[PDB]
């Protein structure tokens, strides 16, 4: 006998529920946050 899980899932009929690196300062680097992307010079304000 086998543990066979029928893996069904709700897909896009609802807002989604089933969904890091180090901080580098003062360099012209690419970045990407939780939601927002970009390329600049990361600083501390």
């Amino acid at each position: 006998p086998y543990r066979v899980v029928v893996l069904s899932f709700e897909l896009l009929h609802a807002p989604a529920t089933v969904c890091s690196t180090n901080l580098v300062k003062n360099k012209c680097v690419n970045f990407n946050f939780n939601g927002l992307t970009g390329t600049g010079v990361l600083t501390e304000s």
Binding site: A14, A16, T17
Partner: protein, 43 residues
């Protein structure tokens, strides 16, 4: 802050929580309370 007994002034509000549920709601009531300073304990 008490000036004369009434709510008026410049107010600012902020988000607290979100629930990504995805349904509609078209009605509401409010669960009230009763206390005396409601058949036996008034409001």
């Amino acid at each position: 802050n008490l000036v004369r007994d009434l709510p008026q002034g410049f107010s600012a509000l902020e988000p607290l929580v979100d629930l990504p549920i995805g349904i509609n709601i078209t009605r509401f009531q409010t669960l009230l309370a009763l206390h005396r300073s409601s058949s036996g304990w008034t409001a």
